[model samples]
Target chain A: ALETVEVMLDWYPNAVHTFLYVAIENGYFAEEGLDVDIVFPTNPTDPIQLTASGAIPLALSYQPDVILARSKDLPVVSVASVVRSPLNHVMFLAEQDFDSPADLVGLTVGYPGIPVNEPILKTMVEAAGGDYEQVHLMDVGFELGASIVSGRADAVVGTYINHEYPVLKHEGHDISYFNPVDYGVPEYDELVLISNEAYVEESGEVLAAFWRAALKGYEWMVENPDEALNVLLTNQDEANFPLIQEVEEESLSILLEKMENPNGPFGGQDAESWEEVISWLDAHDWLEQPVVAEDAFSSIT
Target chain B: ALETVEVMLDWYPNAVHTFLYVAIENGYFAEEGLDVDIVFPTNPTDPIQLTASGAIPLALSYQPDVILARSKDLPVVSVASVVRSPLNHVMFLAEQDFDSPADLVGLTVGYPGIPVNEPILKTMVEAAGGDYEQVHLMDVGFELGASIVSGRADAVVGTYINHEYPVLKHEGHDISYFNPVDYGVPEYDELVLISNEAYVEESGEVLAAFWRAALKGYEWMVENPDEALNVLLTNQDEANFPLIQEVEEESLSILLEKMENPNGPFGGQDAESWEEVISWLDAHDWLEQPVVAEDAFSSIT
Candidate 1:
C-alpha cells in the first residue's frame, strides 16, 4: 500500500529533528502512503553525494554547501527548508567589549578556512572603517573553541552559536559575538531538505505527501512542546554520536524556536533564498560553473 | 488586566498576513493578557522609523532595510521572522531559454533602482561568465511588469515571484525567473517583525507573550487551512486597498506554503542571518556607518 522513501539526515539526530520522528510516531507518513526510512549519515558529508546519486532519495543539507555542489553541476535541488538562518558566527572573549568588526582590526581571528569566511571577515572589517590587512585570520579548522580559550586567536568564525557558543559559555569562556548577517554577510538557509533534481521531477507526488506528513508532525510539535522534546530525546542516533539527554532537552527549546517561521505550512523553501549562497560563492570567485537559480529549487507543494 | 501593544503592519493587509488575524480571532493574544492592535502603515515605509522611535512598539519590516537602518545607528531590532526567503527575483519572458545570467549579457534589464539591485545583477552577470558592462540596466521604478511586457527591457529584477510574476503571467506576458540566489546574490529575510531595541529591553516579557500568542495563531492556521483562508479574506484592509476574493483565495495557498518552515514554534529569528546584507553593502560602500552585527537584532524569545 505504500512506497518507501529513504531520507538521510544531515547528521546524527537529536533535538534538531523532532518533527521527522513525530511524523513517524504519529502515523502521519503512513496515512500518506509513505514508508519513511530515516538514516543517519555515515560521514555527515556523504548525504549530498548520496542524495544526488539516488542512494538517498532525500536528505538534510546546508544551503551554502548545496550551492557549492550545484556549482560543480550536481543535480541537487532544495525541496524544503529546515533551519532558515545561519548558526555560524564570529565570537570573541566577553571582556573585549567589541562593538563592531573595526574592534577586531590588528587582532587574529580564527576560522575553519571556509571560502566564505574570508569575504565575511573582509566585509566586516573594511565596511566598519577598519583595515582588513591589519586583521590576521588564522586557520584553526575544528579548534574554534580551543583557539578562543587558548588565546591563540582574538576571535573566531565558523562556530555555531547554538553548538559552540553554548559549550564555551558552559566552560566559562564567556564569549560575545558577531553574526555574519549583522556584518552584511548574505543570509542563507542553514539547513534545507534536498534531493536530486531528477528524483523530484519523477516522484513529485510522493515527495509532496512526505512533506505533508512532515508538516503535520511539525504542527503537532508546536502544540505539544514537552512531548516533542521527549520524542527527540528518545529517538536520537546513539550509534555514531551519543546525545546527552540534558543537552538535547535544553537545545530542544532553541531548535524548536529556530524551526518555526512566523507564518506556517511547516516546510516551505524558495528559489530566491537559494541565490544568497550563489551570490556569496561568486563574491569569492569560488563558483566552478554557473548554477541556474530556477533549476536549484523545486517546491514540492 | 491587560497591557496593549500597537503593532503597525508594513502595508495594506492581504493574504500575506493571515497569522496576525488568526491570533486575534482565536483570542491567543487576549489569553496572554495583551490587547493586540494591528494598524496598517500610512506610508508603508513608516514602520521602521515608527518602531525605532517607539511610536509603534512593534512593526513589520524587511531584513535588509533593518540592517541599513542599523548602519545609520537606528536602534531597531528584529524580534521575530516573518518571510524567511527573498521573494524578489529576476524575470525574463517565457520565450527566452535563459539558463544563466550569461544569457542576459548585452540585454537590457529593468529594475526599481533599489541600492541592492545593482550589486545583485552585477554579481549574477559578471560571475556567470558575462560582461557586466555589456548588460544594460534601466530604472523602471514600480513598472516592472510593464517594462517586461512592453519589451522595454529584455529582463527585469526586483519583481516578486509570487506577486509580479503571477500577475505578469495572468496578463499573458508569461514570465519565467532567475532567483537572485541562484545567480549568487546573498539571501536575506524578505520580512521580519521589528521593535526598538530599548523597548525590547523594557518589555521583553510582554514581547515574549506576544510571540507565544502569534505562534499559537500560526499553528491554528496550519491545522485549519480553509478556515484560515476565510479569516484572511475577511480581515483584509479594504480602506487603503480593496481585497480580491478570487486573488486572495488563489494566493492564500502560496502564502501559507511560504509561511511554513517545517521544524515549528513560529516567528523565530536569529541575528546571524542579518550579515548577508551588511557584506553586500560593504561591497558597494553603501554603509553610511558601521553597524555591529549583534546590535542589529535581538531575539525576543
Candidate 2:
C-alpha cells in the first residue's frame, strides 16, 4: 500500500524545486510505495509550523530558518539538503560603478526587510572592510528589481544569483553581485528538506526510501536538464510558464553545478558548516539559545 | 525664472501618477515657471521623511500614512488627492467560490503585514457581518497574487482593483474582489499629494502654481488616456513597459471614473470625508492623538 505524504514547499515552484518535480514526473515516490503531495506555503514560516505540528509530514525550508525553528522549540529537523550553496547575494546596478563591497558606503541598500537579511548584508559589508552602519538598509519589499532600475535604490541584498539575476539581465540591465561566502559568512545549504523529529523517528525506513528515490530523481535531473525542465513546466500553472520558464532554464545549470558534493552523498549535510552557521547566528544575537548541529540534521544516507 | 521642485512618488510610476507624468511630458510645469523633478521613492517611508526634512518639496503619499505621520509629529500635510477613491480592496481567486465577505469565515486572508492593514480588513469583515477573528490573516509579503493562485491563501487584502486585479485577470486567473466601502468602511482617498507644513506656508504661490499645472495635467489625462499612457511609457524604462503597460491601460479608465467628484474641482479634498477617515483611524486606536482635518489638507485650488 502506498502511504500518502504531504510536503510543503518553502516558496513558489522554481528551478530550486526541479528535482522534486522530476521525482514526481518519473513516479519515484510511487515506486517507493508513497504518494507525495507538494504544497506551496502561504508564508515562509508556514512550512516549519505545519511540519512541526504534524499537519504536514515534510517541508522544504532554509537552513537558518530551521535553526531558528529549533530555537523556538518547533521539533523540526533537516532530512536532506536541496541546494548545497548560498544563493542569496548582495547585488547592485553595474551602472552605479560599485567595484567592491566597500563601495556600498554612503549608498542605500534595499531588501525584503526580514531580520535575517539585515545580518546577512551587514556581515558581507563588514567583511569587505566597509562600515555597515553607514549603509542605509531600506525595505523595498518585493520591488527589488524595480527599485534598482528606477534609481530609487542604489543596491539591493537578498537577490538570488540563479533567480533575480537572470531575470534582470534578460530585461537588459547591467548587474554586479557579490557572494556571501566570499565574505565572512560560512557556506550553508540554501534549501533543505525538513521534517519533525517524531515523524523522522517513527518512519525511518520510509524516510530512507523517500531519500533513495529522491536522490535518483536528482541524479536523473542532472543527466537530463531539458527533460527535467519540461517536467517542471508540465506540472506548473500554464500562466506562470512564460515568466518562470526562462529563469528556470538559466537557473538549472547553476543549481546543478552546486548540487555536487565531492566528500559525500548528493544530499549530504556538513556538520562543520552547520556549526559555523549556528555560531554566526549566535554572534548576531539572532537566537535565544544555542542549537546543536547533531539535533538539526540526520545522516540519512 | 523657473523654480526647480523635487516631487517624490509613492511607488513606481503607474496609473496613479498619470497626471504628474502627463504634467511633466506636456510641459505644464514649465508653463507654470517651475521645474518638477519627479523622484521614485526607495521605500514607502522615504518620501514622508524626505519631505518632512524639506529634502523634497512635495511627495505623493496615502491619506492614512499622512495621518499616521502627523500623529507621530512628522509635520506632513496633504495638499491634493491624487486618487479620489479607495483603490484597495479584498481580492480572491474566483475558483474559491466565495460569494460574500461572510463567506470569508474560516478562510485565510493574505496581507502585506503592515500594522494598519489588519485593522482595515478586520473592520471590513466585521461590517459585513462576518466574524473577523475566525478569518486567518497571513502576512504573505509581496507574493499576494501567488499566495491566492497557489491555494496558500483563500483571499488577500490590499490588492488595488486598478492594479493587481487586472494583472491576475490577464494571467487567466478568475479573480473576484470587494470594495471596502460596500462593507461599511468609510470613504477615503487612497493616494494624496503631500508636503511639509513649512513648504506649504512659505511657498504658497509656488504650491498654487504646482496645483494649477497638476489640475490641467489631470484634465488632459482624463481627456486623452491613451496619449497620457504613451507619455508615461515614453518617460519610463523600456524594460518595465511590457509588464506595466497592460496594467496601466486597464487601470487608467478605472482611475478616471473615480477622479470625478460632484462637490468640487479636480483633486479637491472634502473636509467631511477627511473627518470620517480620521474617525475611522481613531476607532481602530491607530492614532496617538486626534488629528484635525483642517491641518491635514489645504484647498490648493
Candidate 3:
C-alpha cells in the first residue's frame, strides 16, 4: 500500500519540473511507498494556505514565499531547493535601453502584484542613484510579457529568463532583462519544495526519500538527455495555457544554467544562502514576524 | 539511483492513466527502484515497435496488439491488465436509431483505420443477420467524433464509450453505443501493460514492482476520489488535443464500470481469458499467424 501525499506545484509544469517528472515516470516515489498526487494552486495563495493547514503537506514554493509565510507566522518551511538562484528579473523589450535603473527615472514599471517585487525594484532604482518615487509602479498582474510587448508598461519585473522572456523572443520580440541579484537585492533560491513544520516533525524520513528520489531523477536526466527533454514536455500543463515547443526548448536551456547548485547534493540547500536571504529580507523590514535561518530549511537526512 | 524504464502510454492521458500518475506522484515506483518515464506513442505503432526493439522496455498495448504481434513472430507479451474490458464501441447519435448492427443496412461506417476494426464491424453486421456487403466502410482516421458529429460518416466503429462518445455528449449531442462484446466480438482485455520478451525475461522482478506499485496507485485513487479525479485531469495532454472538463468528468464514470475486475486482483490477468480471445480471433481468421494462450500473457507475480 502507498501513502497518498498531496503536493501543490508552484506554477504550470515546465522544464523546471523535469527532475520531478523523471522521479515520477521512473516510479522513484512509488518505490518509497508514496503516491504523490499533485494539484496546481487555483488561487494564488492556495499553496500557502493548503500547505500550512497540512491539507496539502508539501508544495513547490518560492524561497521568498517561505520567508514571507514564516514572517506571517505560518509554519511553512522549505524541505529542499529546486532552483537555487533567482528566476525573477526586471525586463524590457529591445527597443528600450536602461543602462541602469536610473534610466527608468520617468518610465512605468510593472510587476505581478507580488509585494517583494516592488521592494526589489525600489532597491535597484535607489541603488543606481535614482529616486525610487521617480519610477512609476504598476501592479500589472502576471501578464508580464504582454505588458511590455503591447506597450502597456515600459518595463516589468517578476518575469523569468526561462519563461516570459523567451516567450516574447520566440514570438519575434527581442527581450532584455536585468537580475535583481546583480543590482541591489541578494540572490535567493527561486523555487523550493516546501512543507509545513508539523508534517515534517511527524514523518521526516519521507522528506529524505522524496528528495533523494528527485535527485535521482535529475541524475537519470543527465544521462538520458533525449528522454529527459521529452519527459519534461510530456508532464506540463497545456490545458489552460499553450506552451510553444520552440519557446520551451529555449527555456529548457536557460533553466539548466540556473538549476545547477554548488551546494551539497541535488536539491540540497546551504545554511549560508538561507541566512543571507533571511537577513536581507529582515533588513528590508519584509519580515513581520521574525524567523531564524535554521527553522527555514531542513537537510534531507 | 533509480533505473530508467520508458513505458509508452496506451493513449492520451485520461481516466485510464489515473493509476500511473498515482504511482508516479506517490513515489511507489521510486521505492521499488524503477523510474517509469512515460511518453505517448506518436505513430500509433510506436509502442509496439519500440517495446519489441527494447528501445522502450515496457509499453501500454491493446490485448489484440500483443496477440497480433506474437502471430507476426514479434516477441511481445502482456505483463498485466490495465483496462480489463473493451472501451472501443460502435456508436451513433442518439438522434439515430440503431437497436443493433443490422440497422446499418446501407449506411457508411467509419473507423480509425486499424485492421481489426474492419473485421470486428463485418462480424457485427453479419451476426445481426445484415449483409456485410450492404454496409459501406470508411477508414476515417482518428476523427471519430467529428466524423459522426458533422455527418461525414453515419457512425464510428473505433471510438470509445469513455472517450469520444462522452466528448460528443458534452458538446450537446446524446450519443448511443454498443460494445463489441454485446454483439459477435468475444470479450477481451481492451488494454494491457506489456513488454518485450527479452526485457521481461531478464528483469521479471521489475515488472512485478511495476504492477504492484501501479495497483497501489489505483488503491490510493479509490480512497481519494477528489484528488484522484484532479490528478487525472492534471496529467493529460492539452498540447495536441483539447479536453473538456465535463467530457472528462463524464468519461471517468464510464471508465469505472469497465475497469472493475472480478476475474483476478488489480491488474491480474487470467489464462482462460487470453485463450478465449485467441480462439475467437483464430476462428474469425483474424490471426494469420498462430499463437497460444500461455505465451500471450504473464500474471504479475
Candidate 4:
C-alpha cells in the first residue's frame, strides 16, 4: 500500500469538485501511490480550519476564504484548482420592478451571510452607480432560490446557470444574473485544493504528483460528464445527488470558460490576476498583515 | 457654525491628494459654509478604525481597505473617490534575465509584512502562468529600493511608479513594472472619502453638500495640477512633500485613465467591475463576512 493521506473536502458534491471525484473514481491517487481518503466536512469552513491546524492533509476552499484564512495566520497553502473560472453571480427576479442597478436602491438583497458575499455585492452595485447603502441586505441562508422567488429579497447571490437557472426556468420564474467577474473584479478559481504549509513543505513533490493524476481524472470527467455524474451519485447521499449533479454540471460551464487550455494543463500561475486580487483586498482594508501573492500558492518545479 | 464636520485624510500630502489640497487652497470648503478640519493619523491603519468608530466624520482611503474594514463590522462607508485606479505594481530588475511571466519562477520578491500583498502577487502571477511561490518573498520594510538595488530581494510590492520608479531611473537602474490595474484587478480609487454610518444617517444631506464642494475642488485641481501640487506641499510636512508630489503625479496618470470626463461626474459606476472584485475576494477568502459590493460603498441621494 502507498503512504496513506487523509483529505477533507470543504463543500459537498458539486461540479466545482469534478476533479476530486474523477481522481478517486479513476484511481488517480492510487496510481500516484497515495492512499487517499477524501472526506467531506460538516461545514465548508471546517476544511480550512482543519487544514490550517494540520489536522487534515488537504481540503477544498474558495480563494477569498483562503486569503482571509492565511491573513489570520492559518499557514494553509492553496495547492491546486479545478474550476478556473467563476461560478458565482447575483440572481434577481427578472419580473421585479428593479430595472437597472440603480433601481436596486433601498431594496433588500438576500444572501447567505458570508462576509465576502456582501462586499462582493456591494462592490458590484457600487460599480454600477447604485449606492450600496440604498439597499438593505438580509441573510437568507442557502435558500437563495426560495428567498428571491418568494419575494423575500429583490436579489440574491450564488447562481449557477446549469442548476439555479434551469430550476428557476422550470418554475417559470423570470430571473436575471449579474456575474462578478464580468464586472471589474479579478477572476478567481472557484474551487481550490489547500494543504498545510508544513505538509506541503514536507511532501510537496508527492502532492504535486497526486495533483497531476487528479487533473487527469478531471480531464476524463470532462470527456464523460454523464458517467462522471453517475459516479458522483454513488458517493453522494441519494437525496442530494440530483441537486449536486445539477449544480456540478452548471458549474462546469464556468469551469470551461476559465480553463486556460482545454487539455493543455491544470493548475498554473497568473501574477497579474493575483496582484489584482491583492490590490482589491488592500483597497478593502482586509490585510491586517499583508501576504504577497508569491506566498499564497506554490507550484511544482 | 456649519456643523463642525471632521474630515480625515489617509495620507499627508501625496500628488493624488491634489483635490483635497485644492479644496483647501481654493476655499471650496468655506464656500459650502462648512468647517472641515483635516486630520492625519500617525498609524497607517487608524483612518478606517477612526471612521468606523465615528471619531471622525469623513476620511479618504483605498476601496479594498474600505471593503475589508466594513467586513470586520465597521459602520463606515466610502462616500467619494480621488484616484480611480491602482497605483501599486511589481518591480523587477531589467537585467535579471527573465522573459515572459514563466521566467519569473525561482526569483525573489520583496514586500512589507502584510496579508493582502500575498494574494495580489499570487493571483496576478498565476494568471500569467507564473507560480508566485517560484519567487521567494522577503519582508523588507519601506526600504524596498535599498533592498532591490542592494540585491537583497529580486522584486518588491508597494513600488509606486511616482517614487520608486523615478528613484530607480535616476540611479540608472534598469527596472520593469507590472502595474496592478493592467492585470485584471478591480479599478480602485486610491483616495476615497469615507465617513461614519451614523453621521450619514443623521446628517447625510449636509454631508452630500460638502462632498459637492469637495468635488469642485477636485475639478479645479484637474485644471491646475501644478498649483495643486503647491497646495499639497503647503499642507504636507517638508521632508515628504517632494516624494508625495511624484507619487501624486504618477497617481494622477492612473486617475486620468479611469476618469472618463475628469471632474464632470463624481461617482463612476461599473457593476461588472465591482462584481469582479467581490468574486476575487470571495475566491480568496478574505471576508470575515462577505459584504455585497453594493453595501461596500454609500452615496447621498
List the candidate 3 regions with Cα displacement exceeding 4 Å.
Answer: A1-301, B103-106, B133-136
What tens digits encode model 1's per-residue C-alpha lDDT throughout A1-301?
7889998886557677888899999999999999999975423355788987788789998787777778888888888888887777889889878989988886777764444466667776766889987786654333456666656567887677767777677767788998878776677777889999888888889999999999999889889988987887778644223456666667667766677775756666765677766786677676788876787786799
Can you tell me the CAPRI class of model 2? incorrect
lDDT of 1 by residue, B1-301 (tens): 8889998886557676788899999999999999999876433346887888779899988787787777778888888778877878889888887888889886777765443566677787866888886776654433455556656467888777766666676667767788778776677877789999889999999999999899888888889877987897788744224456666666666766666676854666655677766787677566788876677777778
Task: Write candidate 3's Cα lDDT for A152-186 as tens digits.
Answer: 46788878888887777778888887778777787
Task: Give per-residue lDDT, candidate 3, residue B150.
Answer: 55
The local lDDT score (0 to 100) that residue A36 gets in candidate 2 is 86
lDDT string, candidate 2, A71-102, tens digits: 87879999988888888888878888876778
Regions of model 4 farther than 4 Å from truth? A244-254, A260-264, B1-301
Q: Which number leads on DockQ?
A: 2
- Candidate 2 wrong stretches, greater than 4 Å: A52-54, A103-107, A113-115, A138-143, A237-247, B1-111, B114-156, B159-177, B183-301
What is candidate 4's CA lDDT for residue A100?
54
For residues B194-284, write the lDDT of model 2, one tens digit per residue.
Answer: 9999988889899999999998898898889799888877676343223467887888878887877667788788888788888888787
For residue B75, give model 3's deviation from the true position in Å.
1.6
lDDT of 4 at B206: 80
- Clash pairs for candidate 2: none
Instruction: Report the lDDT tens digits of candidate 3 across residue range B1-301.
Output: 8977788876557777887888998899998889989876533455777888788888887887788888888889898877788888998888787888988877767665445576678778878889977776544333456557756467878788788877777788888877787778877777788898888889889888887788888888778755887887777765334467777767767766667676657777888888988887788777878998899888768
| Residue B107 in model 1: lDDT | 71
lDDT of each: 0.75, 0.78, 0.76, 0.66
Q: Candidate 3, residue B207: CA error in Å?
A: 1.7
Classify candidate 4 by CAPRI docking class: incorrect
Worst 10 residues of 4 chain A by lDDT: A237-246
